[PDB]
UniProtKB/Swiss-Prot annotation, chain A:
Residues of the full protein shown: 181 to 230 of 880
Function: Inner capsid protein that self-assembles to form an icosahedral capsid with a T=2 symmetry, which consists of 120 copies of VP2, with channels at each of its five-fold vertices. This capsid constitutes the innermost concentric layer of the viral mature particle. It encapsidates the polymerase VP1, the capping enzyme VP3 and the genomic dsRNA, thereby defining the core.
Subcellular location: Virion
Cysteine-cysteine disulfides: none
Modification comment: Sumoylated with SUMO1 and SUMO2. Sumoylation of viral proteins seems to have a positive role on viral replication.
Assembly with partners or alone: Homodecamer; each decamer is made up of two conformers of VP2, called VP2A and VP2B. Interacts with a VP1-VP3 complex. Interacts with the intermediate capsid protein VP6. Interacts with NSP5. Interacts (via N-terminus) with NSP2.
Entry's family note: Belongs to the rotavirus VP2 family.
Domain of life: Viruses
Organism annotation: Rotavirus A (strain RVA/Cow/United States/WC3/1981/G6P7[5])
Site feature (Interaction with the intermediate capsid protein VP6) residues: 40, 44, 48
The protein's name in its UniProt record: Inner capsid protein VP2
Domain notes per entry: The N-terminus binds RNA. It is necessary for encapsidation of VP1 and VP3. The N-termini of 10 VP2 molecules form a cylindrical hub underneath each 5-fold axis of the inner capsid.
Lineage: Viruses, Riboviria, Orthornavirae, Duplornaviricota, Resentoviricetes
Swiss-Prot record, chain B:
GO molecular function, one term: metal ion binding
Effect of residue 70 to A: Loss of in vitro DLP transcriptase activity, no effect on particle assembly
The keyword Protein transport is annotated on this UniProt entry: no
Task of the protein: Intermediate capsid protein that self assembles to form an icosahedral capsid with a T=13 symmetry, which consists of 230 trimers of VP6, with channels at each of its five-fold vertices. This capsid constitutes the middle concentric layer of the viral mature particle. The innermost VP2 capsid and the intermediate VP6 capsid remain intact following cell entry to protect the dsRNA from degradation and to prevent unfavorable antiviral responses in the host cell during all the replication cycle of the virus.
Lineage of the species this protein comes from: Viruses, Riboviria, Orthornavirae, Duplornaviricota, Resentoviricetes
UniProt family annotation: Belongs to the rotavirus VP6 family.
Note: The VP6 trimer contains a zinc ion located at the center of the molecule. The zinc ion is not essential for either trimerization or transcription activity of the DLP. Zinc-depleted VP6 has an increased sensitivity to proteases.
Source species of the chain: Rotavirus A (strain RVA/Cow/France/RF/1975/G6P6[1]) (RV-A)
Residues of the full protein shown: 1 to 133 of 397
GO cellular component: T=13 icosahedral viral capsid; viral envelope; viral intermediate capsid
Annotated protein name in UniProt: Intermediate capsid protein VP6
Amino acid sequence: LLLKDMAVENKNSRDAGKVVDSETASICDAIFQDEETEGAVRRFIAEMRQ
Amino acid sequence: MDVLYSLSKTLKDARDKIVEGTLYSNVSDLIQQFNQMIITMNGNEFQTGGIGNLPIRNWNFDFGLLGTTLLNLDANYVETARNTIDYFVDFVDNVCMDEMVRESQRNGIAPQSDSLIKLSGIKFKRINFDNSS
Amino acid sequence: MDVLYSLSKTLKDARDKIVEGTLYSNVSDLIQQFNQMIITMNGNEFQTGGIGNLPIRNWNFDFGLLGTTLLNLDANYVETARNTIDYFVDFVDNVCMDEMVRESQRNGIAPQSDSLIKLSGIKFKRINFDNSSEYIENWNLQNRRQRTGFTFHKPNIFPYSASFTLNRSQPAHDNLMGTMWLNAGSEIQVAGFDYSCAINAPANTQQFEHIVQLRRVLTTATITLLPDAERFSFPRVITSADGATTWYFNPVILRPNNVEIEFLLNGQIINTYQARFGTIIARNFDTIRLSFQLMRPPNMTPAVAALFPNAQPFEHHATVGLTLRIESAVCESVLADASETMLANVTSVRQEYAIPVGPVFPPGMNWTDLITNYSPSREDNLQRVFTVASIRSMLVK
Amino acid sequence: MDVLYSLSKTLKDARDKIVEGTLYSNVSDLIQQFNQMIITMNGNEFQTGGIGNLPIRNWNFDFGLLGTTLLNLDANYVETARNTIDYFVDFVDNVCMDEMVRESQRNGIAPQSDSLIKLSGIKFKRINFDNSSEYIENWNLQNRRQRTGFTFHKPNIFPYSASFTLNRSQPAHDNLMGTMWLNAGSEIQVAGFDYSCAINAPANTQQFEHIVQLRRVLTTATITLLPDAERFSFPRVITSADGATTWYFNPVILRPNNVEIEFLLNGQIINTYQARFGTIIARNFDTIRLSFQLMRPPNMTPAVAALFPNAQPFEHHATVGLTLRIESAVCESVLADASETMLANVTSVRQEYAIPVGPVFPPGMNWTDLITNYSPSREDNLQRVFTVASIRSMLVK
Amino acid sequence: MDVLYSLSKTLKDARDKIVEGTLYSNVSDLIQQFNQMIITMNGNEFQTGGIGNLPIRNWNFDFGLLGTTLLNLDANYVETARNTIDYFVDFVDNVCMDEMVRESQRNGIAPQSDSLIKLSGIKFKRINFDNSSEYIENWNLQNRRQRTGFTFHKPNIFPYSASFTLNRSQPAHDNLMGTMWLNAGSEIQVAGFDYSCAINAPANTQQFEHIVQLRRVLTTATITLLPDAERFSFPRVITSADGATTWYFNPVILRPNNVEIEFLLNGQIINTYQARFGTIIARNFDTIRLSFQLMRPPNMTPAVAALFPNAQPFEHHATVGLTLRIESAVCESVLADASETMLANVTSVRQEYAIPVGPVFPPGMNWTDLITNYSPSREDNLQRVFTVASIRSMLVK
Ligand SMILES: [Zn+2]
């Protein structure tokens, strides 16, 4: 296995954050918006770069 | 000189603020500073001792950056870090001691050791920070 | 019970083979066993303590398992594991100790504590594994009604006994004949004395004998037998048999004559050695009989002749002796010896927690008292209690 | 360090489980571990020796992995393997020895040699496994800070000390009162003597006491306590305290009266035994106090009365004594004992290679000197050095 | 031979790791090994016994394999297994015993019995496995002709010897000078006596010396050396050298002066200690030499002066002594010691079955006789026989 072959854009966040696979992606964009999710969440999702 | 200072507050605020548990953003501003260092260093070779009973030790730099990621720092993250710190500690000790014994009349306020004279170099100034000690 | 055992070898082979770095495929077979446990446990509640100065700590179970992936182990993996182990350690300790104090006249061979009684339950049996620890090894072989066996360096078979027997005495205690000895642990020292130096004895020889009956049979014993009893080779002032006065013993030592050691089993001579000093083997015996004589020297230089007059006062007391030490032996029953810490562990846990004297063991787990009246109940309880001490020492020393 | 350990259990479980005829699958889990090593190694070069008479040999690695010919190994398989093992054996030996001689005051708990310092490197951790060897087991538990613990037979806790203390003396040394003793290894013998046989003493009783302070606490000790000190039961000519003359000791032995043994910990009595001879347990102590008395016999036969006149000269010297032996015990610190070869291994390697005296250990690794001033530095160095000796003995004896 | 070994570790690791409960996965690697055996055996036929009182027994093989199916283990699984093990146990016992009795001069190293000779056959080699049992470990290393080594507590290196040597004597035996000693097991006690208290000796000092030659080299020895020989500190009446009369020994003890212990190897001093009492290390030696002196006290209180007149009769005999004990050591040759049961096992099996005296071993496997004339043949036979005893003790104690 290899990962580049699965690369995906973490639509949100500075640092050209790229994430694992489609599902990984979805989830992020999803939660990002469920307003009742600790400020730490967006943060983590954010800055966490490949 | 001032250079030297940083090297430490770097490590202290490091061996201190970096521990199994802490949340991310409490090291963001710090982490950076750190890496910045490793870079400037890697490639340059050093030498301490040569006087009296002071062992002549050789130092080399070639360490990987960091996994600027994981949220609530996992144990594993630390240990891979602490291993890198310990080489710098054991380093500085030898650096301090080596410049803590040489005396110069004419100009005795300036740096003496081959170790430090090299630090006052410009290419290193990229490190100085938090001079509150 | 056997259950218990596992719990440990699990943890040991765990706190041992699980270190930052090692390759997974070294623990694959292990990891499994582990998890299997957590499962069986989770959903169970326990309670230990309640006696004397022993705290009553309560426990519950609810744990996640362990990854199976990873070629090698990362530090992080360990710490998340060690945290789970430490709760089990601190657990078992409390479990052992709780069952290491209770005694039962009836079934002193069965589980006691609310903690363990629950373990012998069937639903827990799914955890047994690797029974190679010498003690458990023998626990099983016995439960199946078979031939047990243990190993001991300087076993502790002789209850302390230090006394004498005057075969010829008189009020003044100026012309005595008899024996004095010290039986303790794995050693026997015995001296035969004759104040008259066999002056009026047939063939000028006085016969002596010392018999020691073991409370348990010893097999495959390696024994050191030496002439002389150093312990009884010096001047002494001793209390009389009735305690009313004191007598004087002023020995002069001669070589024991016609030494014969017999190791008997149920009255039968199994091994016999005639005047053989050094290392001898006694393969199976429940009794030791030492026979030796004092023979008046037929030829004496003046200095010697002067010590042994034809008439009283007898001022130098002719003495012959023997020393016998059991270096190692095997016993079918547990015993204290000079190397194992079992007795000390059991005795120490009871002392530390101020455990009250019970119906089985003598106060303070006193060895002499225990071995002197080594009843079946004391032995079954001792074995249970020694086996638990050995399970505990695999993790906690 | 732990690294080091593996290297061996690897080889042992290797030179052991790898033989002409075993089914592959009995080593599948093993084989792997092995190879893994070779890899991590190859390429890096080492330096051992470079001190005293110790040779400086250079080791380099260039090895092919291990095949897997199915269904039990063929002779050929072994030999091609054994050839590779032998280079590692001869290696480790040189590695151990090189780190078994260096000492350091500041940090004498860490790796010293160029050989080992390089091993603690991270890129090697990938080897560690099966940490069941009692010593390494305790090495780890200490790095994390917890309850360590070792097992010893006839521990060597008492520095050699053979002396006396005259509580009543005079130039002629014809009416002395005091004690003499021998503390050595795991044994203590002490005698109290009173030339006057307590003729003018209150209640005709002379009190004696002997205190021994251990340099380390012993726990779970099984101890033999016997009345009398045979070592001090015979006539002696001794040097006076000031070395200016010699006195005469002519003992006659009486039973020690009101014997009380206390095992104290930080001044507190943990265990106390009153006149109990035989086997006793002392569960945790750093001090032993033996108190005993000489009581003038209230009733004496003529022969006895004659030894103890109302006026000098006092020609027979009343003596009472005790003998105490620690058969086994547990200590949180490494110690020499009567069974382990660690001290002897370390001392022997240093002697054979003419290793110069260093800054930590006394000349010749002298045990008495070491235990007398058992500093933290000496203990950390001793433990490091003992653990290495134990790693070495798994392969080289 | 190695074959034999396996057979056991197979059963042990079997009767141990196989029980009502555990997961298959923990024995998968094991189960296999096992079956593999059954196969190789089945079809073959054996014969054991036939000598002395040893019963003759024939054995056949025709057994089913093992369910490599199941996940966990159900009680039923065990019982159907244990039944098969018990036949092998009762087998091996008979196999061991049968080869533990036969001796042979020419080739006293290789197998003897019809039972074992058949095992060394090639077709069975398909069974070797896990040789970590200290003894077999060394059995192999010796085949490949390499550096072996065992571990012993209170080894048994000194054949019993208790005697004296009068360097100055006369018919009346009233002014003797010489030494007396006891060498036995791991201990030596030697006393030097001078009835004249060096009154006419140069520098008023009498020199003594005691040399003991070991039959095998001991390495890494931890030794206790103490001043005084308690065994020779009391009054004795001894037989004269020619057995024609008896002399009187009335010792008074003085400290040994200028004590020097040398541990030599092939005439070379390897270790030397000057007046060092307590624990000392002797790293490699085949000879011990103890030199010590009696120095007449230059200053004497009246009581002392009275014991040592300028002219005979000499009534108090000045004596100095030493005690040396080898607590532990390593030997390249098998030896009896204070902990191992090997000698006792071999001796016991031979005694129980009334095995006739053979051409190699002394009657009764007498240790003193054996170690006194420890020929290569006796050692090879002893090692074979000790290794078998150790294989047997893994299953039968
Ligand atoms: Zn012992």
